Amino acid sequence: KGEELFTGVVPILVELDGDVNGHKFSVSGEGEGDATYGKLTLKFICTTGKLPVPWPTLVTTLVQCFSRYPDHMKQHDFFKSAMPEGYVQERTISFKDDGNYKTRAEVKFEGDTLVNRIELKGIDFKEDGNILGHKLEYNYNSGNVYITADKQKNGIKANFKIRHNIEDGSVQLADHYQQNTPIGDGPVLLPDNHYLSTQSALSKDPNEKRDHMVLLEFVTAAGITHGMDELY
Ligand SMILES: [Mg+2]
Numbered sequence: 219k220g221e222e223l224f225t226g227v228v229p230i231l232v233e234l235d236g237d238v239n240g241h242k243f244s245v246s247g248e249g250e251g252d253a254t255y256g257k258l259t260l261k262f263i264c265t266t267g268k269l270p271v272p273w274p275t276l277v278t279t280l281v282q283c284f285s286r287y288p289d290h291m292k293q294h295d296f297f298k299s300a301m302p303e304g305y306v307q308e309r310t311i312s313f314k315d316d317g318n319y320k321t322r323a324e325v326k327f328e329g330d331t332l333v334n335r336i337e338l339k340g341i342d343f344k345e346d347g348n349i350l351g352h353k354l355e356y357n358y359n360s361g362n363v364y365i366t367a368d369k370q371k372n373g374i375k376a377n378f379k380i381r382h383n384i385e386d387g388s389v390q391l392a393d394h395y396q397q398n399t400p401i402g403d404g405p406v407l408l409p410d411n412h413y414l415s416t417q418s419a420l421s422k423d424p425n426e427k428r429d430h431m432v433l434l435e436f437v438t439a440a441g442i443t444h445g446m447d448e449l450y
Pocket residue numbers: 383387
């Protein structure tokens with residue numbers, strides 16, 4: 219099954235093409251994931267020049283198959299179950315009092331590398347709002363991603379809120395609506411309601427002159443009832 223592909227360190231490639239309000243840009247990322255520890259280490263580079271939106275607003279778009287699912291809830295890991303053929307991941311990201319991103323990605327193996335290929339379209343952003351005015355801090359909050367089954371499309375949906383810190387002490391909300399559907403025809407795991415608990419750390423490469431983001435993340439699945447407390 220697909221979970222077998224994730225028992226070790228897996229190389230990752232991420233490629234994004236974006237248009238936000240007519241600002242065209244591309245990001246390329248490289249690194250690896252080790253789902254055993256729910257761990258991602260990636261460096262992203264804007265290959266077209268300066269990124270026209272803040273790096274933190276792209277973190278959710280830029281591989282949920284690297285979540286650590288505890289053994290007792292392994293039967294709820296849709297993401298690995300769709301591999302290697304992969305899945306389509308679509309989102310609408312609604313920035314409160316501002317514009318929205320619509321994203322379409324395909325996440326799949328290309329040989330033994332896990333690839334996330336994404337098209338991002340941003341519209342109706344305010345020229346000097348928090349996004350296009352670059353008023354968001356270079357940091358990121360921990361949070362939960364709530365997953366539910368979508369049996370009609372043999373997939374999942376997710377609903378969650380990202381809170382981006384604004385440089386003035388306030389918060390820019392980014393409401394996320396997500397739908398994933400397998401690319402292949404084999405059976406997948408359709409989960410009970412549960413969530414992914416995330417933590418993310420953003421940094422810079424001291425030797426890198428291009429516009430870039432270094433990202434370290436841990437993601438753990440939770441929210442499924444077990445009775446293992448009785449064992450002890
Ligand atoms: Mg603050």
